[PDB]
Design a protein around this ligand. Structure first.
Ligand SMILES: [Ca+2]
Ligand SMILES: [Ca+2]
Ligand code: NA
Ligand code: NA
Length: 435
């Protein structure tokens, strides 16, 4: 079975066709591309090796970022895994690997990586799900030159949760991308600046990862699965020295579905022994990490499995950090959006199986680095319908047709709003400058 992650549907890429994407080339400057992956192997992908990062087609261990980004752009349509913005093996993809597991390992600069994308890869679009705090005139000038020469530059705004400028996103020649969740709410971690230009799906984004390094979750009732609704395995963290480290619980639990009613700030769980405990999330991640509250309420009651669903404040699908100070959550627990949680209410009392599985080939990630490929993927897709238009013209089309989010007009949190592939295409259909 193949799943279409919510982000793919929201940007409106599933309704268009990438049949002409062969006239475009998108270059991914990131941590490499796992070409051995079934959902990425058969893409029209090439790359340019660098002495400091080995093979572009071999990310290495625990260096799956670029593969996740690539999957959002072009995971192959094939009845397995997922699908990217351009899933039909048409778009040309060029890979420049600047990151090793240890960090930046490129023998040269970001400018050099972009040069490679353009000169070696023939890139029309350069997507950069990366950022640094520093800025320079030489870099600003080099990127402006590429942009004026017709290369569309897109990058992540950053996940520091403040107003700091991340570069290259914050240069005028680059589109700074913000992250929003499935309810179109601004992601708490998404940096807000006057450079933020457009938004893309960035919370709980399912995509391809280096084979065997992923993790998935599932909820089954009556022989049917809620996987396609979006089931996130709790990103559990437990104490490790002076900080916290990952401590995922990968197992399955089966039992009658029972809900722990939330009254104010108290929980009415009752006896959850031998039961799958459904509970509404109390609070939300931001200044703190409250996931443990609703989760532990269930555990303390004796729950075998736990399902936390979004509250009205942030009804979208959340993939929060489950900070477990006392390592109390030793059972499988997952997170689902509000709609799914309410639907599960009708199934109370029925046998339910909740499961978290490791060693997978896909995984949910959060980040402006996840929103970025949605934007660059769509930019490439839309541009393929009108390759005669310039990068600046396509950029304008995306901004002019984005769906306004948050406060009316452009804002620092979401820019012009959610990218809209269909509307952007219709815009260029009139002319390279719109109607
Ligand atoms: Ca697939
Ligand atoms: Ca707005
Ligand atoms: Na910018
Ligand atoms: Na920008």
């Amino acid at each position: 079975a193949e799943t279409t992650p919510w982000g793919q549907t929201f940007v409106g890429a599933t309704v268009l066709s990438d049949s002409q994407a062969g006239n475009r080339t998108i270059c991914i400057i990131d941590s490499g591309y796992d070409r051995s992956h079934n959902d990425l192997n058969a893409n029209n992908v090439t790359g340019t090796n660098n002495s400091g990062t080995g093979n572009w087609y071999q990310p290495g261990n625990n260096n799956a970022h670029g593969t996740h980004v690539a999957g959002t752009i072009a995971a192959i349509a094939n009845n397995e895994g997922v699908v990217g913005v351009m899933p039909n093996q048409n778009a040309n993809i060029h890979i420049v690997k600047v990151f090793n597991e240890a960090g930046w390992g490129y023998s040269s600069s970001l400018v050099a990586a972009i040069d490679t994308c353009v000169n070696s890869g023939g890139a029309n679009v350069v997507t950069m799900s990366l950022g640094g705090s520093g800025s320079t005139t030489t870099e600003r000038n080099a990127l402006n030159t590429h942009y004026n020469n017709g290369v569309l530059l897109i990058a992540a705004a950053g996940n520091a949760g403040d107003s700091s400028y991340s570069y290259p996103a914050s240069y005028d020649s680059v589109m700074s991308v913000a992250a929003v969740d499935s309810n179109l709410d601004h992601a708490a971690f998404s940096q807000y600046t006057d450079q933020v230009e457009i938004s893309g799906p960035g919370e709980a984004i399912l995509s391809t990862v280096t084979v065997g390094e992923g993790r998935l979750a599932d909820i089954t009732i009556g022989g049917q699965s809620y996987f396609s609704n979006g089931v996130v395995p709790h990103n559990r963290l437990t104490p490790s020295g002076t900080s916290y480290a990952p401590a995922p619980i990968n197992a399955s639990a089966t039992g009658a579905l029972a809900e722990c009613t939330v009254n104010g700030t108290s929980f009415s769980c009752g006896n959850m022994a031998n039961k799958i405990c459904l509970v509404e999330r109390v609070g939300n991640q931001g200044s703190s990490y409250p996931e443990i509250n609703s989760t532990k309420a269930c555990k303390t009651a004796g729950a075998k499995g736990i399902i936390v669903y979004s509250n009205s404040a942030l009804p979208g699908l959340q993939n929060p950090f489950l900070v477990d100070a006392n390592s109390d959550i030793t059972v499988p627990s997952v997170s689902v959006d509000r709609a799914t949680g309410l639907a599960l209410k009708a199934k109370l009392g029925q046998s339910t199986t909740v499961s978290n599985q490791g060693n997978q080939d896909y995984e949910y990630y959060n980040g402006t680095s996840m929103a970025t490929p949605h934007v660059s993927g769509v930019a490439t897709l839309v541009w393929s319908y009108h390759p005669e238009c310039s990068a600046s013209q396509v950029r304008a089309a995306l901004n002019a047709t984005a769906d306004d989010l948050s406060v009316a007009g452009r804002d620092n949190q979401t820019g012009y709003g959610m990218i809209n592939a269909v509307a952007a295409k219709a815009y260029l259909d009139e002319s390279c400058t719109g109607p």
